[PDB]
Amino acid sequence: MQIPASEQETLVRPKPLLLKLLKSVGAQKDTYTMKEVLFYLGQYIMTKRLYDEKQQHIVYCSNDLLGDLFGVPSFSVKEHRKIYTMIYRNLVVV
Numbered sequence: 001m002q003i004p005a006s007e008q009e010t011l012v013r014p015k016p017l018l019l020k021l022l023k024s025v026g027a028q029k030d031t032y033t034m035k036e037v038l039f040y041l042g043q044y045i046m047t048k049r050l051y052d053e054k055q056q057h058i059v060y061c062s063n064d065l066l067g068d069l070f071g072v073p074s075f076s077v078k079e080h081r082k083i084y085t086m087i088y089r090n091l092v093v094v
């Protein structure tokens with residue numbers, strides 16, 4: 001438990017591109033909990049095959065919409081606070 005329970009349930013309003021991303025893997029809402037956002041990101045990552053083959057906890061998102069949104073070419077799925085930081089730039093808490 002890296003992230004406070006209440007923060008994980010924060011109601012959030014993705015910005016237009018993050019929203020676009022989430023809907024492209026089947027999300028149907030305008031607002032989400034952070035847990036839900038993470039669910040659809042997981043789907044996105046797996047379908048777009050962005051995991052590194054050798055280091056399966058590393059996501060290579062360079063040249064992908066995800067990389068544009070997060071502002072980085074790669075990250076570790078083990079660093080939740082870092083991921084949250086990157087996600088927060090792409091939404092607003094309601």
Ligand SMILES: O=C1O[C@](O)(Cc2ccc(Cl)cc2)C(c2c[nH]c3cc(Cl)ccc23)=C1Cc1ccc(Cl)cc1
Nearest residue numbers: 035037038039041042043045077078079080081083084
């Ligand atoms: O490491 C994971 O792989 C997943 O299976 C898919 C994933 C989601 C988001 C990101 Cl940025 C990277 C990978 C996963 C999950 C997180 N929530 C879930 C809900 C379900 Cl039902 C299944 C998998 C996961 C996790 C857990 C997790 C938890 C918090 C954060 Cl910030 C990032 C990932």
